[PDB]
Structures are given as C-alpha cells and as structure tokens.
C-alpha cells in the first residue's frame, strides 16, 4: 500500500515472489508461476548466448581447438582501466585473457562446433530463443493465461515431458551427435584443422559401442559410447513415456498406482498424495529441487570420474571447477527442497487430505525420526570427526601406531573397495554384458595419460577415504536432521503447538518457554544452510585434495605419476592438523602469493571473501535490539540536522538479520574456497 | 622523507613499470607524475603527508561530499513540501524535477553554508529533537 | 514510474557514476596525490 518503514522495502523484495501471499487462488498463482518459468528460461538463454558469443568474439577457442594441450581456454578479456590488464593471462600463443574454467570450450568441441560462423549462429540462435521465451511468457500470462485443468494434468505432463523431452530430446541429440559431433570430433582427432573441417549446411556397431573407459587421445569417453548411451536413453524413455495414461484408455493412472501401494506398516499408504502434489506448487518444488540438487551432485561425481567432453580430464582447472560448482548447486537445491517441503507443510498441508497416509504417518512418528537422526548424527559425529580428533591426539602425542591410518589401526572402506574391484575387474559378461572395459578408470585403472597430465586413474580408497566418507555421511545426516526437523515440526511442536499459525518464517514465539528463537521452519533452513555449507565445503575439499594427491599429476620419465601434492592424502588427511597444514596452509601459497600476477584477482577475492564472511558474523552474532537502539541515536543526529528521512529507518527484521548473516557467511565462505581452488589449480594444474 | 627523484629505489621501480591504461606510456607517465611527491628511501613508494598530498584532495572530496549531502537534504525539504505524505513515491519513487532542482541548488553549498550557519537554520532545537 | 522507482533511478545513476569514474581513470593516469 504505502512505504512507511525501511522494512517495507526489504519486505517488498522478500515477498515479491511469494505468489501464495500476494494471491489467494491457485489459478492466478499458477499463471504467474508459468509466466515466470518462461522469463527464467529466457534469462538462461541470454546467458547461454553470452557464453557461446564470448567464445566466438573474445576467446582463444579456435587456437585451443587447434592445439588443446598447448592452449588454455580464456574467453574473458578485461578492459585495462585501473591496471586490471594484469588479469589477462599468458594462456599460450600470445592470447591474453582471464583463463575460464566453465568448460564452455569442451562443451562446444563435444558439440563439434569448429566454425566461427557456426558459433555466432549458435549465439544468435540462443539469443532469439531468449527473445521468444520471454515473449512466450508475456503471451501465456497477459494475453492468454492457461487453464487450471492443464496444470493438474500430471499424467499428460509426465508422458509429454518424458517422450517429447527425454525420449525425443535424447533421440534428437543422438542425431546431432552421430551426424555432426561424432564425425567432427573424429576428424579433429585425425588432425583436420578447424578451418579445414566442413560447415554443417555442407554436410550400427561402428558408431555405437560399449568400450567403456576413456578415449586415450581426447581423454573423454568415446563419443561412440556417448551416442549409444543417449540412444539407449531415447529408446528407454520412449517406452517409459508410453507407460502412462494420457487422454485414452492405455497406460497406468498415477492415482490408481499410488492408492494401490499401501501395506501393513504404512497404513492407508499414498492415498491423498496425488491430491496434495497437484493442488500444492510447494510440494512439487520440494520434490523437484530435492531431485534436481541430488542430480547436480551426481553430475559432479560422474563428470569427474567419466569426463565426458574431449580434453576435459587433462583440463584439471575445469574438472575441479565443475565438481565444486555442481556440488554447491546440489547442496543449495537440496536445501531449498527441504525449504519448500516445510513451506508446504505450513501452508499447503490439509489434515483433511492427508489422513493416515504416509505423510500423516510421518508427522505421527516425527519424534522417533528426529530422535533417531539425532542419534545417528551424534554417532557419526563421534565416529568420523572423533576419529580425526583421536588421530590429532595420537599423532601429536607421538603415538602414530595408535592412529587410524593405512598404517597402524586401519579402517578399510571394504564395502566400497569391494564395489571398486567389482567394477574394475568386472568389465564384460556380468549383468548388462559385452562391456569391453570399466565405465571409468576410477574403479581400477592404470593412469590414462593425455599429454603429461593424468586424464583419470584409480581413485583409491583407504582409511583416509573411510574417514572422510563418514565425515560426509555425518554432515549429510546433520543437514537432514535440521531440514527434516524443520519440515516435520513446521506445523507444531511440544514447545509451540500453533507454529503453523505463527507461519513458516517467524523470528520466534518470544522469550518464554525458556526462549523460542529460531523455532520456525525457515530458521531450520537457516541452520540447514550452514550445515549444507559445512558439508559441501568438506566434499569440495575431499575432492580437491584427493584428486590432487592421488589422481591428477604429470607422467615423468618413469611410469610413476608426479601427483600435484605427492600422495600426502593417505597420511595427512587423517588429522585436522593434516588438513590445516598440508591442505589449507600448504595450498593457500598460490592464492596468498597471487598479488602482482594473472591470479591477483583470486588473491583479492580470497581476502574480500574472508572479509564478507567475518562481516556476516555481525549479523549472526547480534540482534535487532542493539541495532534499533543505535539506529535511533543516529536518527536523533539526522533530526538535529533536519536530514531525518521520510521512510523511518528501521533495524532489519530478526529474520532478515539472520538471512543476510547467512547470505554473507555463505558468500564469504564459498568465494573464499573458490579463490583458493582457482589460484591453486590455475597456477599449478 | 626524500624526493622520489632523489630516492634510488623509486628509479628501480620506474624502470620496470606496469601500464594501467591501454596506452604504453601510462606507466612512465604515472612515475613521472609521482616523482614530485616525497618517498621513503628503502621502500621507494610515494608517501602522503598530512598540503598538495592530503589538504587539496581533502578539499575536493569535502566539496563533492557536501554537494551530495546538501542535494539529499534539499530533496528531503522538497519531499516534506511537495506532498502531505513525504515517504510514499517521494523516497521510494524519486521526483526527477525536484531532484534535478536539488542538484542545481547543490554544489552551491559553500556560499549557502554561510547563510545556513547564520541563525542556526541547519540545527533544530534540542527540545524538538525526538529522544526518549 | 519505473524511472521514479529507486532501483532503476539508482541503477542508471550509479551505472553513470561508476562509468564516469572508470572513464576518468581510463583518461587520467593513476592519481595518488594532487599534482
């Protein structure tokens, strides 16, 4: 209505996208949401156009494509104004620019794009795709709002989005692959110059194999295997999409299948879930973000272990940047999944609809779940982190024989080691048969070398790997504990039986009952984000150090690899002093010594990230109280001088204080690690 | 502590210099300009001494800061006089005519300051100043 | 209306001030002290 307090501005930005709040009817809501999804797709198309455009216009793409081993991708030239010219790096062949790590070039080469015409064509293609997707949103909202029935048509939407997109998209892409990408990559490996290779307009066991492992020239997976994989998925998805019931008598009705599935333990089973899923956006966003996040995390692992694109394996900078980027997106999305599961539980949950179904039964034993997670988190905490502590004490006490290590007391990750032998040795003629080799060398392999660099190798598993794995298990369970607790207690607890009424975000229910600060589901996402940060920070560190101590390196005279950190993981990663010294201290040498170099920007961002992180402690450690008292003294000083603003200046909400605390904590911590990784791997790798 | 020209360290720094601007001569131009200021013998890095060093750019800074402060103050007066309710579309939405008038009357703050100081126009009485 | 709103007004103003200072620095070399 009116902007009376500075809080209004903040609230505007906060609840601007809270369609549920602004509107009352699922119709007007779903219209807004659909339109936005278009908007967003256009933002992504702009961004994709940007990437292929920068690759076309300001890049060493063509030089790289000519000689990948020699050149270093850099599609990011910086205007020289304040002496930032220095950020432009000697990436080889005299091109000076910021060494990009997105792996865009590998994407394009894999797509078999060799022509500057082709790349500009792709840029403008994606940009018009943006221009149409934003307008499509305008059309579908302003001009022609869609119909509630269409939205609730989940069976139609499934069949469509699973053949039209998955089945058909995979067939489409396999066409584009076998026809354009696969032969282009074959030619480029054979050594046909980029110029020499023909433009696209000019124009089954041979092109479809089950070789496994990697192309020893490019270092990527055989694009034959890629084609065959995508084709396989096209086949599978065409069938699978045919296995639903859209506007005919043929297929399974989801509601039939769901309500079928009950049992002894789960009472009435899934009866009511189709209803909540269809009626509640948040339920969908929850399930989706959870699986989307989980997908990014699988992406990270898969792309490092089975580096798909040509020369990616050798490009250690991209292999790291992509694992870490995807892990971050994963964790953030998984948590937003939990978030929207809680927003669902608060807003879009009806006891009417869910009655002795799996969801109601969850809420009905929610103390056994929280209690047991609490227990498994304490347990894992002690038997992961406590094993590091144990080792810090033993090693500092000079009792190395009493440590958990490959030497002395040994915790071999036998289940994993077993699966590894079972994937390395079991190449052909088991379950899915006729596999010439292992899916990746990670399982078991002698180092494949592309140039000096190890493309991929046996990622071993010892005590260090058992320990760090339990650290991951620990932190994921704590993050689940916080998140599942914020979901299952968003409605109510023994402390606040009317939490549903207090809302999803509320700062607290005031100081009584001992204090109820941070008792909301939102507050649980707050705390969950700090644990997702702690979890993914340690996953990204585990990756970085294990890769650069046990996988990556250079082949010397002898068969042996010259690992980036010379195999100190096995002995140094099993103590916290190990990590402080041989990881953060040892490996921050690049970023701290990066000033007056190409990587100076990583140095500056290392510091600035340390600053943003520390600064967020201002928000997390203090309360709105002190700030509103101080703000009003400052206002008195503007009142004396008749500068006092129209919009009364208010200390930010309790929840906002927390949200910016968290934002700055995450930005600082993440960027800090980012600086450290980039400086170290751009310089060394 | 000693003129940069005199200091031998500064000459070393001058020889190998990083060009900020596109033009090749930016590095040499910068050092040539910096020769005037006094720099420490071991470091050979220009130092700033609390008139040319600090006072002059201090004055420029203060002029600009006073300008932007005065412009904001003037626009606040415009807000509380334009409409019965100042905040609504007076702060969130910025009246460009009122703002540009405020800016034009801004940068005249040095002459304006004498008048403002006279009769304590700027200051509001302690009695009025809201304080719990 | 959009022009009146702080975000757009400020966006233009600072994209101007920032560009202005960038342009100033582009033209005039590193100025540590007033000459």
């Amino acid at each position: 209505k009116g902007p009376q307090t500075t809080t209004w501005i903040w609230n505007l930005h906060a609840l601007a996208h809270d369609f549920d709040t602004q509107t009352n009817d699922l119709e007007e809501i779903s219209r807004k949401i659909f339109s936005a999804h278009f908007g967003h797709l256009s933002i992504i198309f702009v961004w994709i156009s940007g990437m292929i455009f920068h690759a076309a216009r300001f890049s060493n793409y063509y030089a790289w494509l000519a000689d990948p081993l020699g050149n270093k991708p850099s599609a990011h030239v910086v205007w020289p104004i304040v002496g930032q010219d220095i950020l432009n790096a000697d990436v080889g062949n005299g091109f000076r620019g910021v060494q990009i790590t997105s792996g865009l070039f590998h994407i394009l080469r894999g797509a078999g794009m060799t022509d500057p015409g082709e790349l500009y064509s792709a840029a403008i293609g994606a940009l018009v795709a943006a221009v149409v997707m934003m307008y499509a949103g305008y059309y579908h909202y302003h001009k022609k709002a869609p119909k509630l029935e269409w939205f609730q048509n989940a069976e139609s939407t499934m069949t469509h989005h699973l053949i039209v997109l998955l089945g058909l998209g995979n067939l489409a892409w396999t066409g584009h692959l076998i026809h354009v990408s696969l032969p282009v990559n074959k030619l480029l490996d054979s050594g046909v110059a980029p110029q020499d290779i023909p433009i696209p307009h000019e124009f089954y066991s041979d092109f479809l194999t089950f070789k496994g492992g990697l192309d020893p020239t490019t270092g990527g997976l055989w694009m034959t295997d890629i084609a065959h994989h995508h084709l396989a998925l096209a086949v599978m998805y065409i069938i699978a999409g045919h296995m639903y019931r859209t506007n005919w008598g043929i297929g399974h009705s989801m509601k039939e299948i769901m309500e079928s599935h009950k049992g002894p333990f789960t009472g009435e089973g899934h009866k009511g879930l189709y209803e909540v899923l269809t009626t509640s956006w948040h339920a969908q966003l929850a399930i989706n973000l959870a699986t989307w996040g989980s997908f990014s995390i699988i992406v990270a692992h898969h792309m490092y272990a089975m580096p798909p694109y040509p020369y990616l394996a050798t490009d250690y900078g991209t292999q790291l940047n992509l694992f870490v980027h995807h892990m971050w997106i994963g964790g953030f999305l998984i948590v937003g999944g939990a978030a929207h599961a809680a927003i669902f539980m608060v807003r879009d949950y009806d006891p009417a609809v869910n009655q002795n179904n799996v969801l109601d039964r969850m809420l009905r034993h929610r103390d056994t779940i929280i209690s047991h997670l609490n227990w498994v988190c304490i347990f894992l905490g002690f038997h992961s982190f406590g094993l590091y502590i144990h080792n810090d004490n033993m090693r500092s006490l000079g009792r190395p024989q009493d440590m958990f290590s490959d030497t002395a007391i040994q915790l071999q990750p036998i289940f994993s080691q077993w699966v590894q032998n079972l994937q390395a040795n079991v190449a052909g003629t088991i379950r899915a048969p006729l596999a010439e080799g292992a899916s990746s060398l990670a399982w078991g392999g002698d180092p494949l070398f592309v140039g000096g660099k190890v493309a991929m190798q046996h990622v071993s598993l010892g005590t260090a790997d058992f320990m760090i794995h339990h650290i991951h298990a620990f932190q994921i369970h704590v993050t689940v504990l916080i998140l599942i607790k914020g979901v299952l207690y968003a409605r109510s607890s023994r402390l606040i039986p009317d939490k549903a009424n207090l809302g999803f975000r509320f700062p607290c229910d005031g100081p009584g009952r001992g204090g109820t600060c941070q008792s909301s589901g939102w507050d649980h996402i707050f705390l969950g984000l700090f644990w997702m940060y702690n979890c993914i920070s340690i996953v990204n560190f585990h990756f970085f150090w294990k890769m650069q101590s046990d996988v990556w390196g250079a082949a010397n005279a002898n068969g042996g690899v010259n690992y980036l950190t010379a195999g100190n993981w096995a002995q140094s990663s099993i103590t916290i002093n190990g990590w402080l010294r041989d990881f953060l201290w040892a490996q921050s040498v690049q970023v701290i010594n990066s000033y007056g170099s190409a990587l100076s920007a990583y140095g500056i961002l290392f510091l600035g990230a340390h600053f943003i992180w520390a600064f967020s402690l201002m928000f997390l450690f203090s309360g709105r109280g002190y700030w509103q008292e101080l703000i009003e003294s400052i206002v008195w000083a503007h009142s004396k001088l008749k500068i006092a603003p129209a919009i009364q200046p208010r200390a930010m909400s309790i929840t906002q204080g927390r949200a910016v605390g968290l934002g700055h904590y995450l930005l600082g911590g993440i960027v800090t690690s980012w600086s450290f990784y980039l400086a170290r791997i751009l310089a060394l790798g | 502590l000693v003129p940069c020209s005199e200091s031998p360290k500064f000459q070393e720094r001058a020889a190998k210099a990083r060009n900020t601007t596109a033009d090749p001569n930016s590095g040499q131009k910068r050092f040539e300009m910096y020769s005037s200021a006094l720099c420490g013998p071991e470091d050979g890095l220009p130092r700033i001494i609390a008139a040319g060093d600090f006072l002059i750019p201090g004055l420029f800074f203060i002029y600009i800061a006073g300008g932007i402060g005065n412009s904001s103050r003037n626009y606040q007066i415009a807000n509380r006089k334009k409409n019965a309710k100042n905040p609504a579309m007076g702060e969130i939405i910025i009246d460009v005519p009122l703002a540009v008038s405020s800016t034009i009357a801004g940068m005249a703050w040095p002459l304006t300051a004498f008048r403002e100081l006279t009769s304590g126009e700027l200051t509001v009485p302690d009695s009025d100043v809201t304080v719990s | 209306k959009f022009f009146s709103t702080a975000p757009v007004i400020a966006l233009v103003f600072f994209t101007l001030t920032a560009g202005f200072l960038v342009e100033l620095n582009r033209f005039f070399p590193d100025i540590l002290f007033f000459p």
């Binding site: 170099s597 100076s600 | 720094r13 900020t20 910068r30 420490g40 130092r47 700033i48 609390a50 600090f54 | -």
Partner: peptide, 28 residues
C-alpha cells in the same frame, strides 16, 4: 593496487606526530 602490481599507487601516510614524539621503534 599492490595486487594489480602497482604498489606505487598505495596511499602511504607517514606518522608525522609519531616522528615528532620519537625503546621507540621506527613508525612507518
């Protein structure tokens, strides 16, 4: 500026009053 490899441009302010007053170590 030091990162950008132009340490010259640093705002180095000498502690003049410290010099005036000055067991006492060089205040730079």
């Amino acid at each position: 500026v030091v990162a950008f490899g132009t340490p010259e441009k640093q705002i180095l302010v000498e502690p003049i009053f410290a010099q005036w007053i000055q067991p006492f170590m060089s205040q730079g």
